[PDB]
């Protein structure tokens, strides 16, 4: 009706103020706390710029050409087609640089941890995400829009040939979520070994002990039938496969610790072993001060690493799991465009993709910006704090 | 580096046998030394083990009792004794060498073995 | 006691240039402390796999072995003349702890 006009346009105007406002505190969170300017919030910030142009140059632009009479020229109308691909595909060129910069810093950890690369790189990385996005939607459709009518101006005019819709459908979201779990799985790949080699290892090295231990126990209270061979055959099996657990000096420190362990045992089987009448009362308690000085070190320090490596395991799972909802999200909002415009193609010259669904679905996309900002402090939630 | 034997030839039963390892080349008190005999036909068993070093000397099970091992470190050589013989120590004696726990001589045992000897009770 | 070193095969034959797998197991576990030795008639025994997978110095790496738990496994890819003799394992746990293993004929 007519009085439907200026509802939809408040509507409009009350959807792009909420979004510039979410925007807004979200880049004021960034911008006053110095916490979050580490290299998990540089790769970060653009996600709540790009989208943030949107609300600002999307929604209000689009109020002349569909609620007013249109008004503006075909250079205006380009531009905002323009700024539209330009913020679309930097929230997910940015998330595909957020990956890449996750699987450096995980992968690459032996080099790009110990030492970081310089920031210099970093924003030069930035701008060239935006320029990577216009790489891909600026010039192609640009040379495929050269169409003579007037019906749906600022509709695409590459629309109705299905090979470049194909191929461009392609480039802009199935390559990022290739690279994107590509990514995940290497992380997650990668940390699994780092653990599954510790957790073995370490319990390895738990077994050992408490076999030591128990063979031990037996040696303290020795008994009258000469019994401490037998105990003492495993504590050198024991000590033996302890060893070869290689978690240098720090290696040497370790080794030779060893040593001197199964040394003791060696002279203290010796007794034993002779055959000689006097076994000196199983004197192996030494090994105490042994067990609790010298190999006491490495059973609390490798015990600590596990832990630091199953933390790590737990913060590369959250990261991952935001980056999938947020790639889902993504897709789900994604998809009912790219299911009406290369399956509608057959037809297009009258009434073919003039439709309510389709209207919807350009909504649609604009909403993926609307709840991104939503959703963008589940991640960390600093910005709900301050 | 070859560990000979001239202990060859044929006793008694219950007499006394001697027998003779000497060291080519290599200390004897950095190297214990390792006896294992081998029946005709049947698998290798050891017999006893001598060190010139902390003069450890450690017999088998079924040996002790009617062996004595003793090693000079002057002569270089080590000479075991089998007071006893029950006709079950018809066999082939060979003597190798053996390295102390530190490092690789432990981990690499029973090396350079020697051509052996034949005794028949 | 006496840890007692069990060689499963005892006797096997294979045409020449072909795989075999010897097996050796030991009561008690034991730490990379089982060798293997090959002994020729009128010869003494000799070293080959020494810890639980290498080869000492004087051995071509046809020769393999490799250890998981108590199994230890001899693995000769390629035959040839000159291999065809008895195998033994030996546990050097300790010095009184010697054992030798039956022996494998191939």
């Known amino acids: 009706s007519l009085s439907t006009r200026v509802t939809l346009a408040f509507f409009m105007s009350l959807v792009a103020f909420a979004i510039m406002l979410g925007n807004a505190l979200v880049i004021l969170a960034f911008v006053v706390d110095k916490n979050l300017r580490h290299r998990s919030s540089y790769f970060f910030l653009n996600l709540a710029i790009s989208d943030f142009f949107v609300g600002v140059i999307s929604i209000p632009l689009y109020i002349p050409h569909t609620l007013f009479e249109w008004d503006f020229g075909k250079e205006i109308c380009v531009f905002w087609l323009t700024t539209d691909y330009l913020l679309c595909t930097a929230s997910v060129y940015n998330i595909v640089l957020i990956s890449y910069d996750r699987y450096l810093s995980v992968s690459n950890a032996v080099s790009y941890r110990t030492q970081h690369t310089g920031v210099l790189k970093i924003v030069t990385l930035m701008v060239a995400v935006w320029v990577l996005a216009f790489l891909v939607n600026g010039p192609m459709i640009l040379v495929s829009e050269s169409w003579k009518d007037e019906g749906s101006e600022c509709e695409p005019g590459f629309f109705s040939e299905w090979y470049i819709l194909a191929i461009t459908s392609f480039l802009e979201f199935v390559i990022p979520v290739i690279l994107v779990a590509y990514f995940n799985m290497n992380i997650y790949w990668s940390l699994w070994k780092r653990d599954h080699l510790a957790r073995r290892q370490l319990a390895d090295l738990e077994d050992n002990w408490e076999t030591l231990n128990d063979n031990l126990k037996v040696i303290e209270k020795a008994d009258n039938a000469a019994q401490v061979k037998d105990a003492l055959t495993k504590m050198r099996a024991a000590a033996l496969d302890a060893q070869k657990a290689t978690p240098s000096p720090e290696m040497k420190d370790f080794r030779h610790g060893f040593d001197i362990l199964v040394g003791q045992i060696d002279d203290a089987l010796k007794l034993a072993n002779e055959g000689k009448v006097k076994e000196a009362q199983a004197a192996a308690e030494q090994l105490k001060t042994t067990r609790n000085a010298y190999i006491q070190k490495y059973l609390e320090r490798a015990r600590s690493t596990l832990q630091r490596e199953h933390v790590e395991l737990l913060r590369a799972r959250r990261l991952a799991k935001s980056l999938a909802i947020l790639l889902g999200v993504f897709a789900v909002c994604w998809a009912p465009y790219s299911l009406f415009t290369i399956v509608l193609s057959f037809y297009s010259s009258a009434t073919g993709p003039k439709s309510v669904w389709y209207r919807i679905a350009f909504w649609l996309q604009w909403f993926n910006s609307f709840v991104n900002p939503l959703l963008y402090p589940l991640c960390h939630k600093r910005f709900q704090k301050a | 580096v070859q560990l000979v034997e001239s202990g060859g030839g044929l006793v008694q039963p219950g007499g006394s046998l001697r027998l003779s390892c000497a060291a080519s080349?290599?200390?004897?008190?950095?190297?214990?030394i390792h006896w294992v005999r081998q029946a005709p036909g049947k698998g290798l068993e050891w017999v006893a083990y001598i060190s010139s070093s902390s003069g450890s000397t450690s017999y088998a099970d079924s040996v002790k009792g009617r062996f004595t091992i003793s090693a000079d470190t002057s002569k270089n050589t080590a000479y075991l004794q089998m007071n006893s013989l029950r006709a079950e120590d018809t066999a082939v004696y060979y003597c190798?060498?053996?390295?102390?726990?530190?490092?690789?001589?432990?981990?690499?045992?029973?090396?350079?073995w020697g051509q052996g000897t034949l005794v028949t009770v | 006691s006496d840890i007692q070193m069990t060689q499963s095969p005892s006797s096997l034959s294979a045409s020449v240039g072909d795989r075999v797998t010897i097996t050796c197991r030991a009561s008690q576990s034991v730490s990379s402390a089982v060798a293997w030795y090959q002994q020729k008639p009128g010869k003494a025994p000799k070293l080959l796999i020494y810890?639980?997978?290498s080869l000492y110095s004087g051995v071509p790496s046809r020769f393999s072995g490799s250890r998981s738990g108590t199994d230890f496994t001899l693995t000769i890819s390629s035959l040839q003349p000159e291999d065809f003799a008895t195998y033994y394992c030996?546990?050097?746990?300790?010095?009184?702890?010697?054992?030798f293993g039956q022996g494998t004929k191939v």
């Open positions: 030996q546990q050097y746990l300790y010095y009184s702890l010697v054992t």
């Open positions: 080349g290599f200390n004897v008190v950095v190297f214990s």
């Open positions: 190798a060498r053996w390295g102390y726990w530190p490092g690789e001589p432990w981990w690499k045992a029973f090396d350079y």
């Open positions: 810890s639980a997978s």
